[PDB]
């Protein structure tokens, strides 16, 4: 007989390694042989050897969400003791590669890479300073790479976190930030036109903007074009110095820092 190691403790778990510690045996030993095997039939077995005074061991190179059984053996040149057994399940690995597609004024479609570990459901949460925290339902199952966030507030920097769930465990979140689109100004109405000037007004969008960009360009004819930069609180414009009897196109762009809304467009002809 060789007195077995006693009271095995698991000090750390993660998606590819298990850390265990044990109490030294009573018999004088040359070392300890630790082994890791999946609790089911198949799989790969990892075997490491600890020193005679080593009571801890980390086993790397494992697979995520696998029920491993760790056996410790007290060793001599003559033989081996009986194994102290202790089971442990590896954690689920982190999803990576968050992609943002079809970013609209109201919707953001996200895509990611499925982790190698078997995932039951996902938990997609998204948030922004303007509309708080939301959790998506129904939670995407493990056999899905896509997710569509709907009903978002325009002109908002949204943060999206995706975490994989398997039974009791949670992965590390994969986080990615993405801003929604700014809607175009509405109800572009021309108020007064002259042979050399026009006046237009609009209903401003429901976003805190940094300014506007209005560009006036002739249609069906070649000539000068004008572009004015306006304050964010503006809702109308007067463009002067235009040509006589001239079909002009007026585009109103809403600007919030680095993002540009679609143009609120309208066509009008100057006076003959």
Curated annotation (Swiss-Prot):
Organism superkingdom? Eukaryota
Which regions are flagged for Low complexity bias? 35-52
Q: Where is this region: Disordered?
A: 29-53
Question: Which residue intervals define the domain Fibronectin type-III in the entry?
Answer: 4-95, 96-183, 184-272
Location comes to: Secreted, Extracellular space, Extracellular matrix; Secreted
> How does the record describe the protein's post-translational processing?
Sulfated. Forms covalent cross-links mediated by a transglutaminase, such as F13A or TGM2, between a glutamine and the epsilon-amino group of a lysine residue, forming homopolymers and heteropolymers (e.g. fibrinogen-fibronectin, collagen-fibronectin heteropolymers).
Q: Quote the tissue specificity entry.
A: Expressed in the inner limiting membrane and around blood vessels in the retina (at protein level). Plasma FN (soluble dimeric form) is secreted by hepatocytes. Cellular FN (dimeric or cross-linked multimeric forms), made by fibroblasts, epithelial and other cell types, is deposited as fibrils in the extracellular matrix. Ugl-Y1, Ugl-Y2 and Ugl-Y3 are found in urine.
Assembly and oligomerization: Mostly heterodimers or multimers of alternatively spliced variants, connected by 2 disulfide bonds near the carboxyl ends; to a lesser extent homodimers. Interacts with FBLN1, AMBP, TNR, LGALS3BP and COL13A1. Interacts with FBLN7. Interacts with COMP. Interacts (via type III repeats 9-14) with TNFAIP6 (via CUB domain); this interaction enhances fibronectin fibril assembly. TNFAIP6 may act as a bridging molecule between FN1 and THBS1. Interacts with TNR; the interaction inhibits cell adhesion and neurite outgrowth. Interacts with FST3 and MYOC. Interacts with SVEP1. (Microbial infection) Interacts with S.aureus FnbA.
Q: Which disease is it linked to?
A: Glomerulopathy with fibronectin deposits 2: Genetically heterogeneous autosomal dominant disorder characterized clinically by proteinuria, microscopic hematuria, and hypertension that leads to end-stage renal failure in the second to fifth decade of life. Spondylometaphyseal dysplasia, corner fracture type: An autosomal dominant form of spondylometaphyseal dysplasia, a group of short stature disorders distinguished by abnormalities in the vertebrae and the metaphyses of the tubular bones. SMDCF is characterized by flake-like, triangular, or curvilinear ossification centers at the edges of irregular metaphyses that simulate fractures. These corner fractures involve the distal tibia, the ulnar aspect of the distal radius, the proximal humerus, and the proximal femur.
**Known role:** Fibronectins bind cell surfaces and various compounds including collagen, fibrin, heparin, DNA, and actin. Fibronectins are involved in cell adhesion, cell motility, opsonization, wound healing, and maintenance of cell shape. Involved in osteoblast compaction through the fibronectin fibrillogenesis cell-mediated matrix assembly process, essential for osteoblast mineralization. Participates in the regulation of type I collagen deposition by osteoblasts. Acts as a ligand for the LILRB4 receptor, inhibiting FCGR1A/CD64-mediated monocyte activation. Secreted by contracting muscle, induces liver autophagy, a degradative pathway for nutrient mobilization and damage removal, and systemic insulin sensitization via hepatic ITGA5:ITGB1 integrin receptor signaling.
Full protein name: Fibronectin
The source organism is Homo sapiens (Human)
């Amino acid at each position: 007989e060789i007195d077995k190691p006693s009271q095995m403790q698991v000090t750390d778990v993660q998606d590819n390694s298990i850390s265990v510690k044990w109490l030294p045996s009573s018999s004088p030993v040359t070392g300890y042989r630790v082994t890791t095997t999946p609790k089911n039939g198949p799989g790969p077995t990892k075997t490491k050897t600890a020193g005679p005074d080593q009571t801890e061991m980390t086993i790397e190179g494992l697979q995520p969400t696998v029920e491993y059984v760790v056996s410790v053996y007290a060793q001599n040149p003559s033989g081996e003791s009986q194994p102290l057994v202790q089971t442990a399940v590896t954690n689920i690995d982190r999803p990576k590669g968050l992609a943002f597609t079809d970013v609209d004024v109201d919707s953001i479609k996200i895509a990611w890479e499925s982790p190698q570990g078997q995932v039951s459901r996902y938990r997609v949460t998204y948030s922004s300073p303007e509309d708080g925290i939301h959790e998506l339902f129904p939670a995407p199952d493990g056999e899905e790479d896509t997710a569509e966030l709907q009903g978002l507030r325009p002109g908002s920097e949204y943060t999206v976190s995706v975490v994989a769930l398997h039974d009791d465990m949670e992965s590390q979140p994969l986080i990615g930030t993405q801003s929604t689109a700014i809607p175009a100004p509405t109800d572009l109405k021309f108020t007064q036109v002259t042979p050399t000037s026009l006046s237009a007004q609009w209903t401003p969008p429901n976003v805190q903007l940094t300014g506007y960009r209005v560009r006036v360009t002739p249609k069906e004819k070649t000539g000068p074009m004008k572009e004015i930069n306006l304050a964010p609180d503006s809702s109308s414009v007067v463009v002067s110095g235009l040509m006589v009897a001239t079909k002009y196109e007026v585009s109103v762009y809403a600007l919030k820092d680095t993002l540009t809304s679609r143009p609120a467009q309208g066509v009008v002809t100057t006076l003959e």
